[PDB]
Amino acid sequence: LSNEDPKDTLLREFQEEIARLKAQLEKKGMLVEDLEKERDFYFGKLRNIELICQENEGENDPVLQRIVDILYATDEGFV
Amino acid sequence: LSNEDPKDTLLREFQEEIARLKAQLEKKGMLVEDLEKERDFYFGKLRNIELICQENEGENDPVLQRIVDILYATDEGFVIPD
Numbered sequence: 104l105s106n107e108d109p110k111d112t113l114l115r116e117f118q119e120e121i122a123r124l125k126a127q128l129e130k131k132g133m134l135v136e137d138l139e140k141e142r143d144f145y146f147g148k149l150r151n152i153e154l155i156c157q158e159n160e161g162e163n164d165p166v167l168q169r170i171v172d173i174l175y176a177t178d179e180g181f182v
Numbered sequence: 183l184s185n186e187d188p189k190d191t192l193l194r195e196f197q198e199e200i201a202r203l204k205a206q207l208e209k210k211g212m213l214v215e216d217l218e219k220e221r222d223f224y225f226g227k228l229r230n231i232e233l234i235c236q237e238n239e240g241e242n243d244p245v246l247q248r249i250v251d252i253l254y255a256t257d258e259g260f261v262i263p264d
């Protein structure tokens with residue numbers, strides 16, 4: 104059991120908790136940035152595949168139409 | 183100005199700051215989960231597309247080959263189709 108004034112104990116502990124929370128926020132911010140990069144990466148692939156379907160008359164090609172259906176599905180387009 | 187002990191003032195203000203930071207951390211956690219769901223949504227579409235390319239393996243379809251090239255690309259950015 105400490106001999107310190109409890110108010111002094113808590114002022115120190117609360118400042119340590121504030122610092123810890125700020126550090127956790129920085130860590131979660133970097134996770135967000137990583138996830139934005141991965142999300143952008145996969146969306147960029149979908150966009151590039153859409154451009155291929157557009158260049159190659161996807162609406163006149165039955166296999167490409169099924170890929171187009173996935174591109175524009177509001178769910179994952181699973182069949 | 184108040185007659186409050188400055189230590190009592192800071193004990194209250196520090197706990198208010200802790201509560202605000204915990205709320206910010208919850209919000210960032212929600213953003214992480216939103217981004218994971220969006221990323222998984224797009225990955226699932228790409229996986230479904232790859233299965234259609236797999237189904238057509240043996241046809242030598244050059245448009246499907248260009249799609250597979252995108253699926254397995256390592257670089258970011260737009261690819262202008264030919």
Ligand SMILES: [Mg+2]
Binds near residue numbers: 158159264
């Ligand atoms: Mg052409």
